């Protein structure tokens, strides 16, 4: 309604709404910033190197409904990325060794 | 190119400012134009006086004659020109009037209702001040593509209230400028979206936002503290302090016009680094747009050197 | 590129069966008492 804060705005430590919710494995919070459609750009990386099941099925499973109008436009927020560009989300989860991330991911043609 | 945005709250006069890029830059609004703005001028003439009336209970006001009763019970029903002339006329629905910062009346409404002669005839072509004096809210995006000193204006209008929020988001992208529209006259008024909210303060967070926002760090901000024209008026009879406590100056049109231009202008958290540029306006005065938009494409130009 | 399956069937868990053993895992007594007195 007002403008006045810039969710998908970052740290002095480069993590952002959404990554300090994947860190503190807060399920009601991580929902909720997905809900008002915050930036997601390398988030499901995050969270197969923490290894938290449930955030990686978040984050797999609500990047497809309600997307409505592209992503609302977002600039300068892409440079910092933890993971390395060439990264993927099923090597990075063989390289974690978690096993049911890499079953989740396996299931869906990767 | 220039990508120009209106920005500002409900009823601030973004889409008079619109009108005006039609006449100031074209030829503008044709007889026939101005003859689809017929029922609009009729509606708002219409719901003016009925939410006048309806005022009249909330707050304790007798009619000044009985025999209005039965004209108010007529225009909610619906000779139509008989009973608006009557009620408006009525000493009672013109003690209401005086008081419409109590309730939510459209500035243009005495406008008509003083010329309902006019309006009412069968003949009735709207003029182009009666077009410009219309109100039609304004809910989505309306861009046009104007041409300026030969710039290619891409202008964005948007919707002024909070409900209409969510658009403004998708068409922050490549803000060349934006007027940010602030009518002046709104110091003692409250939201239609909501009555314990003033307009004058909910105008500064906005703008606080707006000038603010690292989206528009390079575009161009200029500021129109519009209604220029009913605040002059208005400012003999209501008192700033309504809008700002603290405020000591006279309740004259330059010392309290100065005074908000200087609480919008304080709003910027980057003064050292960004300017605002302000200009007073009657939007409903096309010599007066044309003159103000004239200055504002130079400040563009020399911006984008 | 090199396709991968799962090579050994392991049956999917159902959606009620799935936040059974979630609620199970999470400790709620209560979602866990209405799925066991609705099952049977
Ligand atoms: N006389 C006069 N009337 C004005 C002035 N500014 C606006 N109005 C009138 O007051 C109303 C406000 O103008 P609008 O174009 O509806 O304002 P807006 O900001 O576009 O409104 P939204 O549709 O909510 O965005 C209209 O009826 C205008 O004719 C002004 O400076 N002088």
Same mark, same amino acid.
């Given at each position: 309604?007002?403008? *006045?804060?810039?969710?998908?705005?970052?740290?002095?430590?480069?993590?952002?709404?959404?990554?300090?919710?994947?860190? *503190?494995?807060?399920?009601?919070?991580?929902?909720?910033?997905?809900?008002?459609?915050?930036?997601?750009?390398?988030?499901?990386?995050?969270?197969?190197?923490?290894?938290?099941?449930?955030?990686?099925?978040?984050?797999?499973?609500?990047?497809?409904?309600?997307?409505?109008?592209?992503?609302?436009?977002?600039?300068?927020?892409?440079?910092?990325?933890?993971?390395?560009?060439?990264?993927?989300?099923?090597?990075?989860?063989?390289?974690? *060794?978690?096993?049911?991330?890499? $079953?989740?991911?396996?299931? $869906?043609?990767? | 190119?220039?990508?120009?945005?209106?920005?500002?709250?409900?009823?601030?006069?973004?889409?008079?400012?619109?009108?005006?890029?039609?006449?100031?830059?074209?030829?503008?609004?044709? +007889? /026939?134009?101005?003859?689809?703005?017929?029922?609009?001028?009729?509606? =708002?003439?219409?719901?003016?006086?009925?939410?006048?009336?309806?005022?009249?209970?909330?707050?304790?006001? /007798?009619?000044?004659?009985?025999?209005?009763?039965?004209?108010?019970?007529?225009?909610?029903?619906?000779?139509?020109?008989?009973?608006?002339?009557?009620?408006?006329?009525?000493?009672?629905?013109?003690?209401?009037?005086?008081?419409?910062?109590?309730?939510?009346?459209?500035?243009?409404?005495?406008?008509?209702? =003083?010329?309902?002669?006019?309006?009412?005839?069968?003949?009735?072509?709207?003029?182009?001040?009666?077009?410009?004096?219309?109100?039609?809210?304004?809910?989505?995006?309306?861009?046009?593509?104007?041409?300026?000193?030969?710039?290619?204006?891409?202008?964005?209008? #948007?919707?002024?209230?909070?409900?209409?929020?969510?658009?403004?988001?998708?068409?922050?992208?490549?803000?060349?400028?934006?007027?940010?529209?602030?009518?002046?006259? /709104?110091?003692?008024?409250?939201?239609?979206?909501?009555? +314990?909210?003033?307009?004058?303060?909910?105008?500064?967070?906005?703008?606080?936002?707006?000038?603010? =926002?690292?989206?528009?760090? +390079?575009?161009?901000?200029?500021?129109?503290?519009?209604?220029?024209?009913?605040?002059?008026?208005?400012?003999?009879?209501?008192?700033?302090?309504?809008?700002?406590?603290?405020?000591?100056?006279?309740?004259?049109?330059?010392?309290?016009?100065?005074?908000?231009?200087?609480?919008?202008?304080?709003?910027?958290?980057?003064?050292?680094?960004? +300017?605002?540029?302000?200009?007073?306006?009657?939007?409903? /005065?096309?010599?007066? #747009?044309?003159?103000?938009?004239?200055? #504002?494409?130079?400040?563009?130009?020399?911006? =984008?050197? | 590129?090199?396709?991968?399956?799962?090579?050994?069937?392991?049956?999917?868990?159902?959606?009620?069966?799935?936040?059974?053993?979630?609620?199970?895992?999470?400790?709620?007594?209560?979602?866990?008492?209405?799925?066991?007195?609705?099952?049977?």
């Amino acid at each position: 309604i007002y403008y *006045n804060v810039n969710i998908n705005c970052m740290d002095p430590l480069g993590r952002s709404a959404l990554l300090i919710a994947i860190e *503190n494995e807060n399920l009601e919070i991580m929902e909720l910033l997905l809900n008002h459609s915050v930036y997601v750009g390398d988030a499901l990386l995050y969270a197969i190197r923490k290894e938290v099941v449930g955030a990686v099925e978040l984050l797999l499973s609500y990047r497809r409904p309600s997307g409505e109008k592209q992503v609302p436009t977002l600039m300068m927020d892409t440079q910092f990325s933890e993971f390395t560009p060439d990264i993927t989300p099923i090597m990075l989860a063989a390289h974690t *060794n978690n096993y049911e991330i890499i $079953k989740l991911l396996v299931q $869906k043609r990767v | 190119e220039v990508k120009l945005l209106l920005l500002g709250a409900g009823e601030s006069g973004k889409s008079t400012i619109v009108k005006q890029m039609k006449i100031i830059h074209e030829d503008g609004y044709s +007889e /026939d134009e101005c003859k689809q703005y017929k029922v609009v001028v009729y509606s =708002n003439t219409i719901q003016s006086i009925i939410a006048i009336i309806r005022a009249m209970g909330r707050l304790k006001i /007798d009619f000044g004659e009985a025999a209005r009763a039965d004209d108010a019970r007529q225009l909610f029903v619906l000779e139509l020109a008989g009973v608006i002339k009557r009620l408006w006329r009525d000493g009672g629905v013109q003690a209401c009037f005086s008081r419409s910062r109590e309730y939510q009346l459209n500035d243009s409404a005495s406008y008509y209702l =003083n010329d309902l002669d006019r309006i009412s005839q069968s003949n009735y072509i709207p003029t182009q001040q009666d077009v410009l004096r219309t109100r039609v809210k304004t809910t989505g995006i309306v861009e046009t593509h104007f041409t300026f000193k030969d710039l290619y204006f891409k202008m964005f209008d #948007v919707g002024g209230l909070r409900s209409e929020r969510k658009k403004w988001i998708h068409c922050f992208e490549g803000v060349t400028a934006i007027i940010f529209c602030v009518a002046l006259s /709104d110091y003692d008024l409250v939201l239609a979206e909501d009555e +314990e909210m003033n307009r004058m303060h909910e105008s500064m967070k906005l703008f606080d936002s707006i000038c603010n =926002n690292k989206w528009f760090t +390079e575009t161009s901000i200029i500021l129109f503290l519009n209604k220029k024209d009913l605040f002059e008026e208005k400012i003999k009879r209501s008192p700033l302090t309504i809008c700002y406590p603290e405020y000591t100056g006279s309740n004259t049109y330059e010392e309290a016009a100065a005074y908000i231009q200087c609480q919008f202008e304080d709003l910027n958290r980057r003064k050292d680094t960004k +300017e605002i540029y302000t200009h007073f306006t009657c939007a409903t /005065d096309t010599k007066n #747009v044309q003159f103000v938009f004239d200055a #504002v494409t130079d400040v563009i130009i020399k911006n =984008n050197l | 590129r090199i396709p991968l399956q799962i090579v050994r069937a392991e049956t999917e868990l159902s959606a009620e069966e799935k936040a059974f053993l979630n609620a199970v895992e999470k400790g709620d007594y209560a979602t866990v008492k209405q799925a066991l007195q609705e099952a049977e």
